[PDB]
Design an enzyme around this catalytic site. Structure first.
Site, PDB file in Angstrom:
ATOM      1  N   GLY A  24       0.808  -1.208   0.000  1.00  0.00           N
ATOM      2  CA  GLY A  24       0.000   0.000   0.000  1.00  0.00           C
ATOM      3  C   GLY A  24       0.840   1.256   0.000  1.00  0.00           C
ATOM      4  O   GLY A  24       2.073   1.182   0.087  1.00  0.00           O
ATOM      5  N   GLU A  25       0.177   2.406  -0.091  1.00  0.00           N
ATOM      6  CA  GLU A  25       0.876   3.685  -0.116  1.00  0.00           C
ATOM      7  C   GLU A  25       0.014   4.832   0.365  1.00  0.00           C
ATOM      8  O   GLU A  25      -1.194   4.696   0.522  1.00  0.00           O
ATOM      9  CB  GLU A  25       1.361   3.993  -1.523  1.00  0.00           C
ATOM     10  CG  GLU A  25       0.242   4.226  -2.514  1.00  0.00           C
ATOM     11  CD  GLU A  25       0.766   4.269  -3.933  1.00  0.00           C
ATOM     12  OE1 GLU A  25       1.986   4.060  -4.104  1.00  0.00           O
ATOM     13  OE2 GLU A  25      -0.030   4.494  -4.874  1.00  0.00           O
ATOM     14  N   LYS A  46       5.017   0.709   7.839  1.00  0.00           N
ATOM     15  CA  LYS A  46       4.597   1.949   7.217  1.00  0.00           C
ATOM     16  C   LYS A  46       5.732   2.971   7.227  1.00  0.00           C
ATOM     17  O   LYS A  46       6.098   3.495   8.279  1.00  0.00           O
ATOM     18  CB  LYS A  46       3.365   2.513   7.936  1.00  0.00           C
ATOM     19  CG  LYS A  46       2.871   3.838   7.392  1.00  0.00           C
ATOM     20  CD  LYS A  46       1.665   4.320   8.190  1.00  0.00           C
ATOM     21  CE  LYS A  46       1.218   5.702   7.745  1.00  0.00           C
ATOM     22  NZ  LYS A  46      -0.171   5.968   8.201  1.00  0.00           N
ATOM     23  N   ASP A 141     -11.217   9.893   8.357  1.00  0.00           N
ATOM     24  CA  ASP A 141     -11.029   9.345   7.013  1.00  0.00           C
ATOM     25  C   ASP A 141     -11.406   7.867   6.929  1.00  0.00           C
ATOM     26  O   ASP A 141     -10.704   7.059   6.295  1.00  0.00           O
ATOM     27  CB  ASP A 141      -9.581   9.558   6.536  1.00  0.00           C
ATOM     28  CG  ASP A 141      -9.456   9.513   5.009  1.00  0.00           C
ATOM     29  OD1 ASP A 141     -10.499   9.612   4.306  1.00  0.00           O
ATOM     30  OD2 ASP A 141      -8.317   9.387   4.507  1.00  0.00           O
TER      31      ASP A 141
HETATM   32  O1  LIG Z   1      -1.768   3.629   6.952  1.00  0.00           O
HETATM   33  C1  LIG Z   1      -1.948   3.134   5.851  1.00  0.00           C
HETATM   34  C2  LIG Z   1      -2.170   1.683   5.806  1.00  0.00           C
HETATM   35  C3  LIG Z   1      -1.518   0.722   6.488  1.00  0.00           C
HETATM   36  C4  LIG Z   1      -2.160  -0.529   6.037  1.00  0.00           C
HETATM   37  C5  LIG Z   1      -1.969  -1.940   6.527  1.00  0.00           C
HETATM   38  C6  LIG Z   1      -1.568  -2.214   7.838  1.00  0.00           C
HETATM   39  C7  LIG Z   1      -1.444  -3.552   8.231  1.00  0.00           C
HETATM   40  N1  LIG Z   1      -1.714  -4.549   7.357  1.00  0.00           N
HETATM   41  C8  LIG Z   1      -2.105  -4.259   6.098  1.00  0.00           C
HETATM   42  N2  LIG Z   1      -2.377  -5.265   5.245  1.00  0.00           N
HETATM   43  C9  LIG Z   1      -2.641  -5.044   3.834  1.00  0.00           C
HETATM   44  C10 LIG Z   1      -2.426  -6.365   3.040  1.00  0.00           C
HETATM   45  C11 LIG Z   1      -2.847  -6.151   1.569  1.00  0.00           C
HETATM   46  O2  LIG Z   1      -4.217  -5.703   1.490  1.00  0.00           O
HETATM   47  C12 LIG Z   1      -4.437  -4.448   2.167  1.00  0.00           C
HETATM   48  C13 LIG Z   1      -4.134  -4.650   3.665  1.00  0.00           C
HETATM   49  N3  LIG Z   1      -2.235  -2.973   5.691  1.00  0.00           N
HETATM   50  C14 LIG Z   1      -3.105  -0.170   5.158  1.00  0.00           C
HETATM   51  N4  LIG Z   1      -3.103   1.140   5.079  1.00  0.00           N
HETATM   52  C15 LIG Z   1      -4.079   1.920   4.305  1.00  0.00           C
HETATM   53  C16 LIG Z   1      -3.414   2.585   3.077  1.00  0.00           C
HETATM   54  C17 LIG Z   1      -1.967   3.046   3.423  1.00  0.00           C
HETATM   55  N5  LIG Z   1      -1.885   3.819   4.681  1.00  0.00           N
HETATM   56  C18 LIG Z   1      -1.800   5.283   4.745  1.00  0.00           C
HETATM   57  C19 LIG Z   1      -2.703   6.070   3.752  1.00  0.00           C
HETATM   58  O3  LIG Z   1      -4.071   5.794   4.048  1.00  0.00           O
HETATM   59  C20 LIG Z   1      -0.356   5.744   4.523  1.00  0.00           C
HETATM   60  C21 LIG Z   1       0.695   4.836   4.314  1.00  0.00           C
HETATM   61  C22 LIG Z   1       1.999   5.286   4.107  1.00  0.00           C
HETATM   62  C23 LIG Z   1       2.264   6.656   4.117  1.00  0.00           C
HETATM   63  C24 LIG Z   1       1.227   7.556   4.344  1.00  0.00           C
HETATM   64 CL1  LIG Z   1       1.548   9.265   4.430  1.00  0.00          CL
HETATM   65  C25 LIG Z   1      -0.077   7.116   4.546  1.00  0.00           C
END
Ligand SMILES: O=C1c2cc(-c3ccnc(NC4CCOCC4)n3)cn2CCCN1[C@H](CO)c1cccc(Cl)c1
Length: 330
Positions: A24-25, A46, A141
Site C-alpha cells: 500500500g501507499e 509503514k 477518514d
Molecule cells: O496507513 C496506511 C495503511 C496501512 C495498512 C496496513 C496495515 C497492516 N496490514 C495491512 N495489510 C494489507 C495487506 C494487503 O491488502 C491491504 C491490507 N495494511 C493499510 N493502510 C491503508 C493505506 C496506506 N496507509 C496510509 C494512507 O491511508 C499511509 C501509508 C503510508 C504513508 C502515508 Cl503518508 C499514509
C-alpha cells in the site's frame, strides 16, 4: 548485504525486518509487508517521509501519540518504530504494525457479502469507533481501504494520520462549513456493503453535493438553518427541487433494520444524526451488541502543545523524542 528497496523507495529496516513486498501507499510514503526474524511472523511496515511539510509533521506526531495510547481489538496499533540514530539523519519514520490480510475495499471489489457478514463488519467498525470517540478523538477518514481484515473476519481500523482530538465518504457539513462526520462515513460504508458500490461517487465537490441531494432529496429549511458557506448556500438555492429516494428502492433486497439504521446515519443534519452508542444499540446489531465487551478509553485524549503553531523543526524534534523509547539501549 545492504538496505532493501521497493518500487523506488529505500526501506532501511534490516536486519530485524526482511523479505519486503509492496502492500500500500499514501501521500508521503509507502507500506510493505516484511518478515520479522524476532517474532517470526510477517508484519506491516509503514514508511513515512513527512519532514518537508509542517502539516505532515503534525499528522505524523498525532498518529504516533494516538496509536501508542490506544489499545483496542478493532484498532491498528504500533509494535515498533524505526528511524535514524541522529535527528540530522532522520528523513523517514517506519511504523511497524500487525499485518492484516486484506481490506474492505478489495473485499467489496470481489465478494458479495451476506447480511450476517455486513452486520458483523458494521458491528466491529462501530465497536472500534466507540472506543475512538470515547477518547474524544475523530478518525476523519473512514473508508473501505482503511478497514483491514484478516483471515477470520476480524476487522481493524487503520490510518490515524488525519486523526484529531476522501470525497465519496465526506459528510455534508465538511463541504457546507465533530464526531458526526465519522458516523456519516460509516453510513456510506454500510451502503457500499449493501450494494458493492459507493453510494455517493461524486467527481468533484459540487458533484458530491448533487449525488447526496439526489438520494436525500432537497434539504429542508432546518437543514439549511446553520452556519454555512455562502457560495454553497447560494448554489443549493439555485438548484431545482430533488425528490427523496426511499432507501428500499435503492437497496431492494436489504434487511429493513439495516436500512432503518442507514437512514439514521445518512441524515443530512449532523445534529439529527445517530451517535455511535445509539448505533451499536440499534436493532440491526442486536445479535452482536454487548456493552459488557465494548471497552471505552479511560480518559479523553489531549495534547499538551498547540501543534498547529509549531515550526517543522520543533515538530521533528518532538517526533525524535516520541520515537526514542524504541531505540536500542534506551
Ligand atoms: O496507513 C496506511 C495503511 C496501512 C495498512 C496496513 C496495515 C497492516 N496490514 C495491512 N495489510 C494489507 C495487506 C494487503 O491488502 C491491504 C491490507 N495494511 C493499510 N493502510 C491503508 C493505506 C496506506 N496507509 C496510509 C494512507 O491511508 C499511509 C501509508 C503510508 C504513508 C502515508 Cl503518508 C499514509
Amino acid at each position: 548485504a545492504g538496505p532493501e528497496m521497493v518500487r523506488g523507495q529505500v526501506f532501511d529496516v534490516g536486519p530485524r525486518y526482511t523479505n519486503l513486498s509492496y502492500i500500500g501507499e499514501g501521500a508521503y510514503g509507502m507500506v510493505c509487508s516484511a518478515y520479522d526474524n524476532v517474532n517470526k511472523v510477517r508484519v506491516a511496515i509503514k514508511k513515512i517521509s513527512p519532514f518537508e511539510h509542517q502539516t505532515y509533521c503534525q499528522r505524523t506526531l498525532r498518529e504516533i501519540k494516538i496509536l501508542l495510547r490506544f489499545r483496542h481489538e478493532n484498532i491498528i496499533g504500533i509494535n515498533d518504530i524505526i528511524r535514524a540514530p541522529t535527528i540530522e539523519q532522520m528523513k523517514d519514520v517506519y511504523i511497524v504494525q500487525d499485518l492484516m490480510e486484506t481490506d474492505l475495499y478489495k473485499l467489496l471489489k470481489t465478494q458479495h457479502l451476506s447480511n450476517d457478514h455486513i452486520c458483523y463488519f458494521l458491528y466491529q467498525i462501530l465497536r472500534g469507533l466507540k472506543y475512538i470517540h470515547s477518547a474524544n478523538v475523530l478518525h476523519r477518514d473512514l473508508k473501505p481501504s482503511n478497514l483491514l481484515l484478516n483471515t477470520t473476519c476480524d476487522l481493524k481500523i487503520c490510518d490515524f494520520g488525519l486523526a484529531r482530538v476522501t470525497r465519496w465518504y465526506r459528510a455534508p457539513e465538511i463541504m457546507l462549513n465533530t464526531k458526526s462526520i465519522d458516523i456519516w462515513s460509516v453510513g456510506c460504508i454500510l451502503a457500499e456493503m449493501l450494494s458493492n458500490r459507493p453510494i455517493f461517487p461524486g467527481k468533484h465537490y459540487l458533484d458530491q453535493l448533487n449525488h447526496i441531494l439526489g438520494i436525500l432529496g432537497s434539504p429542508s429549511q432546518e437543514d439549511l438553518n446553520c452556519i454555512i458557506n455562502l457560495k454553497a448556500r447560494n448554489y443549493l438555492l439555485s438548484l431545482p427541487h430533488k425528490n427523496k429516494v426511499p432507501w428500499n428502492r435503492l437497496f431492494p433486497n436489504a434487511d429493513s433494520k439495516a436500512l432503518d439504521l442507514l437512514d439514521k446515519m445518512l441524515t443530512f443534519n449532523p445534529h439529527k444524526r445517530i451517535e455511535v452508542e445509539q448505533a451499536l444499540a440499534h436493532p440491526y446489531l442486536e445479535q452482536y451488541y454487548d456493552p459488557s465487551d465494548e471497552p471505552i478509553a479511560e480518559a479523553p485524549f489531549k495534547f499538551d502543545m498547540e501543534l498547529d503553531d509549531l515550526p517543522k523543526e520543533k515538530l521533528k524534534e518532538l517526533i525524535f523524542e516520541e520515537t526514542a523509547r524504541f531505540q536500542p539501549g534506551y
